[PDB]
Amino acid sequence: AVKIGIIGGTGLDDPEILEGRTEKYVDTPFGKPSDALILGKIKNVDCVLLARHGRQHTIMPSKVNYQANIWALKEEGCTHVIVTTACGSLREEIQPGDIVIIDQFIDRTTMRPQSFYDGSHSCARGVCHIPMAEPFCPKTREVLIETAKKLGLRCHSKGTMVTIEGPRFSSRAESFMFRTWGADVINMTTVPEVVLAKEAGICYASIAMATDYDCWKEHEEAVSVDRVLKTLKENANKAKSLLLTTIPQIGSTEWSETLHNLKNMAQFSVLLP
Amino acid sequence: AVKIGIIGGTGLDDPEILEGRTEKYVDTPFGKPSDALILGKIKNVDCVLLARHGRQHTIMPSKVNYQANIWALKEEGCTHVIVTTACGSLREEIQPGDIVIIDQFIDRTTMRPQSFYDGSHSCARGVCHIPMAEPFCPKTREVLIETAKKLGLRCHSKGTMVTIEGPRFSSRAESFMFRTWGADVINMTTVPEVVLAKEAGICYASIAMATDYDCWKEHEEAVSVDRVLKTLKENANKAKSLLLTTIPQIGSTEWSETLHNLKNMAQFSVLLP
Amino acid sequence: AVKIGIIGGTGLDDPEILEGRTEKYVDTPFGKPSDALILGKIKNVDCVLLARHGRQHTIMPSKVNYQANIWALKEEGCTHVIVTTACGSLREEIQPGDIVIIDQFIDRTTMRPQSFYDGSHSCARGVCHIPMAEPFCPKTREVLIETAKKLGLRCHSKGTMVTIEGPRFSSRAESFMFRTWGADVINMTTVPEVVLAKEAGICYASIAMATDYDCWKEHEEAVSVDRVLKTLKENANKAKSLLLTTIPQIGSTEWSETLHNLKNMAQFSVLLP
Ligand SMILES: CCCSC[C@H]1N[C@@H](c2c[nH]c3c(N)ncnc23)[C@H](O)[C@@H]1O
Ligand SMILES: CCCSC[C@H]1N[C@@H](c2c[nH]c3c(N)ncnc23)[C@H](O)[C@@H]1O
Ligand SMILES: CCCSC[C@H]1N[C@@H](c2c[nH]c3c(N)ncnc23)[C@H](O)[C@@H]1O
Ligand SMILES: [Cl-]
Ligand code: NA
């Protein structure tokens, strides 16, 4: 049995993706999630949808309760979490509208709790040092990549996401610098979402959709809210189709060994007194 | 009509620059500014002076209320904010005493709110993603550059400021690293001052004065408080003369289109529910 | 007269190193230290041992009270602080079990107060900008290096420590990136411990013990809690022997000039109103 949490990003958090929808507000030891969980199905597969920024997009990236969001999805019984994220492209070949099935990140966030194990919650006791060598689930990523190909979508099979604190966009000097560091795409939301998913023993993968070229092409038009929303209006259907087609494939394959290994990695990362 | 906010940095916050001075303590939704606003004039031009660190230099860079400072200047009616900042030079050709009319930044701060739109203040509602491709006002920068030339001052027409959290100075490894990133000068105060000014729709420019070579020349003497204060004692007059000569030129030119464009960029950066 | 504070890191905080041990719980203006101070001697030399993470390793690196730890050691009369830290190796030639007598750092922490001079404590008044060009005491480092040679230990005479916030380990993209920045070893605890020691006018040095190769060798096994603990179990004796042999040598040499210079640097870094 699998159950797929879906965290929807900017313009990419469409409830209509699920059949048989039921709204469920929940609480967690880390506070309230961004919004109600939306329980439903894609074909025969149980899913739980959550809008990262709230359904009215009222929560800025620095203020998203990443701990509560991941905790809530885990408590609801999610084995997998597949997310969408709007992002800037830091590479000419990653064009706006392209999907990037990211496999690494570089953290530039500064304000965010990145662990459940903060010494303040009885539900998560001890000191946890989670490994981040492979932050994203390779098996889920492989299904996303194969499915994007079956759909004929422009899709990149790897990429490094730099996550900035925001909510401002990057300066041009920063944008240039991130390119030198080997970042391929830029957002404000991957970290610590991916980190907390790993601590929870959840298979996490991210559908990154390039919405802009940030500002590293000084000759070309630079990113803005309006530019991002426009690209999402034009391209969001691609992420919807990718989720709708990927999720039944995830449901049809065996995950016990993968989930056992993730559970072990999470459990063995915790030092108890 | 223009009104010029002046934020004075270390050793560079001299009230005597203004004629017809009146002290005005104010409050903001983000708390109190660093000190009283000093209202006055330079020739026919209305100005508002504020000491970044307080007039007795009692506020460390991490604790400066950047939100209140920018809010206060905006509420007083400032169209422009021109600031001074003491900084380390990361380039041999930027000598102590030189002015750098910075055009980019790299953020290394970690502790600081960078937006008015934090979801907690009724006066700034929504999620704001401000563009930072061009953080400083090019028209104001151009007047500063031309004026420095008219004054015969050693002045660099561009530069990237790395802003560190502080209050410690950088290690040598950090200083070396910032050079590789393309930083030209180093301080503790540009970010988030420049970011908040952009959200406020204010034309912001910075007169950076090199006070030291940080510590990247291992053979040469490294930065200290005493070294910085000495260089400022010797060179502060240059920033005073630059402000006094620049501000009347700003007053004599037309800003409506520039200010309209900045207002539009700020307004369109805000996502409402 | 010297008195040596010893801050023990992961698996490297063994009370049995001291003869004539007495437990002393203390308070500081910044709160409680990680655990009781352990007063004792190594040969004729007064020492004060403190477990960085608590004696049961219950305190994660982000939550260590670096201010209280350094304050407590200073108040107890420590002239020197020599610490141990487990770390990842970012260089092929730094093998697990090797000691690195680090001489520089790169800060990647985001959550931590780095100064005593926060404008909130009467015991530390003013704005302090401490120099970090030479963060570690070269004379103490030289004794550690010479002593490691006398013991026949694999020991590196310099190295740059990147300190990450944690508690997660780095991603592979981050690990690669830190190598390009010139970091040699990676931990979660050097900053701000070294910074606060400098503000306190204490001679600080660090015995870094490589416990893993982080994750930059994609072909090789990546870091985990279990891997780190295993390497420490096998190699901790080396740090114990190094401390036991170094400390009497520190006791036998003259420190007045070194300590006077550090005191002056600390005092002159403070700007009073
Ligand atoms: C309407 C929302 C305006 S775009 C800003 C939002 N979408 C992501 C984003 C898209 N493009 C970016 C870029 N170039 N830099 C940083 N973040 C982003 C980011 O995670 C943030 O939540
Ligand atoms: C008396 C004040 C001692 S210098 C420290 C102050 N002046 C700036 C500064 C000058 N030189 C620097 C340097 N090398 N690194 C970082 N910041 C600085 C910085 O913005 C800070 O507010
Ligand atoms: C049982 C404790 C598991 S290892 C984690 C602890 N030991 C240090 C460490 C060892 N190897 C590291 C690495 N590769 N990256 C970051 N930090 C570390 C670090 O300061 C942290 O306190
Ligand atoms: Cl950084
Ligand atoms: Na922070």
PDB file of C-alpha atoms in Angstrom, chain A residues 104-115 117-118 127-133 135 160 181 191 195 268-269 271-273, chain C residues 10 56-61 63 108 110-111 166-174 177 180-181 188 215 222-226 229:
ATOM      1  CA  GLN A 104      20.565  17.948  -5.365  1.00  0.00           C
ATOM      2  CA  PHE A 105      20.261  21.220  -3.489  1.00  0.00           C
ATOM      3  CA  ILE A 106      22.408  24.024  -2.136  1.00  0.00           C
ATOM      4  CA  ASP A 107      20.980  25.705   0.974  1.00  0.00           C
ATOM      5  CA  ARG A 108      20.977  29.510   1.119  1.00  0.00           C
ATOM      6  CA  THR A 109      18.179  29.741   3.677  1.00  0.00           C
ATOM      7  CA  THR A 110      18.846  31.305   7.062  1.00  0.00           C
ATOM      8  CA  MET A 111      15.605  31.485   9.064  1.00  0.00           C
ATOM      9  CA  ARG A 112      14.261  27.969   9.025  1.00  0.00           C
ATOM     10  CA  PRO A 113      14.145  25.023  11.448  1.00  0.00           C
ATOM     11  CA  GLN A 114      15.423  21.989   9.498  1.00  0.00           C
ATOM     12  CA  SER A 115      14.788  19.172  11.962  1.00  0.00           C
ATOM     13  CA  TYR A 117      14.521  16.858  16.661  1.00  0.00           C
ATOM     14  CA  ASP A 118      14.882  20.280  18.296  1.00  0.00           C
ATOM     15  CA  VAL A 127      19.761  14.529  18.305  1.00  0.00           C
ATOM     16  CA  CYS A 128      19.208  13.733  14.635  1.00  0.00           C
ATOM     17  CA  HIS A 129      21.888  14.064  11.983  1.00  0.00           C
ATOM     18  CA  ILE A 130      20.117  13.052   8.769  1.00  0.00           C
ATOM     19  CA  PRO A 131      22.262  12.107   5.735  1.00  0.00           C
ATOM     20  CA  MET A 132      21.774  14.366   2.718  1.00  0.00           C
ATOM     21  CA  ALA A 133      24.092  12.758   0.124  1.00  0.00           C
ATOM     22  CA  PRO A 135      18.264  14.018  -0.747  1.00  0.00           C
ATOM     23  CA  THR A 160      20.815  21.280  -8.411  1.00  0.00           C
ATOM     24  CA  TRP A 181      28.631  27.104  -7.518  1.00  0.00           C
ATOM     25  CA  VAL A 191      14.997  23.458   1.814  1.00  0.00           C
ATOM     26  CA  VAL A 195      15.289  17.550   4.741  1.00  0.00           C
ATOM     27  CA  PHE A 268      19.798   5.250  12.766  1.00  0.00           C
ATOM     28  CA  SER A 269      20.362   9.015  12.368  1.00  0.00           C
ATOM     29  CA  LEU A 271      21.288   9.700  18.858  1.00  0.00           C
ATOM     30  CA  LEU A 272      19.490   8.971  22.126  1.00  0.00           C
ATOM     31  CA  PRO A 273      20.974   9.810  25.599  1.00  0.00           C
TER      32      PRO A 273
ATOM     33  CA  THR C  10      31.442  14.015  19.973  1.00  0.00           C
ATOM     34  CA  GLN C  56      24.922  12.404  27.549  1.00  0.00           C
ATOM     35  CA  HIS C  57      25.157  14.147  24.124  1.00  0.00           C
ATOM     36  CA  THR C  58      21.674  15.626  24.312  1.00  0.00           C
ATOM     37  CA  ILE C  59      22.315  19.081  22.813  1.00  0.00           C
ATOM     38  CA  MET C  60      22.367  19.529  19.043  1.00  0.00           C
ATOM     39  CA  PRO C  61      24.991  21.885  17.551  1.00  0.00           C
ATOM     40  CA  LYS C  63      21.329  24.660  20.441  1.00  0.00           C
ATOM     41  CA  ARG C 108      27.907  28.527   7.128  1.00  0.00           C
ATOM     42  CA  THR C 110      22.734  30.887  10.406  1.00  0.00           C
ATOM     43  CA  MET C 111      21.064  30.588  13.822  1.00  0.00           C
ATOM     44  CA  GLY C 166      23.088  21.331  10.818  1.00  0.00           C
ATOM     45  CA  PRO C 167      21.852  19.224  12.314  1.00  0.00           C
ATOM     46  CA  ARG C 168      21.503  17.609   8.853  1.00  0.00           C
ATOM     47  CA  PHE C 169      24.614  16.598   7.014  1.00  0.00           C
ATOM     48  CA  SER C 170      25.502  18.410   3.762  1.00  0.00           C
ATOM     49  CA  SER C 171      24.105  17.514   0.373  1.00  0.00           C
ATOM     50  CA  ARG C 172      26.594  16.272  -2.231  1.00  0.00           C
ATOM     51  CA  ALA C 173      26.258  19.561  -4.118  1.00  0.00           C
ATOM     52  CA  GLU C 174      27.134  21.422  -0.912  1.00  0.00           C
ATOM     53  CA  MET C 177      30.947  23.417  -3.345  1.00  0.00           C
ATOM     54  CA  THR C 180      35.831  24.694  -4.345  1.00  0.00           C
ATOM     55  CA  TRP C 181      35.744  27.339  -1.598  1.00  0.00           C
ATOM     56  CA  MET C 188      28.844  21.967  13.018  1.00  0.00           C
ATOM     57  CA  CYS C 215      29.745  12.668   0.856  1.00  0.00           C
ATOM     58  CA  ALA C 222      28.781   8.512   2.690  1.00  0.00           C
ATOM     59  CA  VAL C 223      28.773   9.880   6.277  1.00  0.00           C
ATOM     60  CA  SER C 224      26.258   8.671   8.891  1.00  0.00           C
ATOM     61  CA  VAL C 225      25.936   8.831  12.683  1.00  0.00           C
ATOM     62  CA  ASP C 226      27.026   5.174  12.909  1.00  0.00           C
ATOM     63  CA  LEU C 229      30.768   6.956  16.146  1.00  0.00           C
TER      64      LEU C 229
END
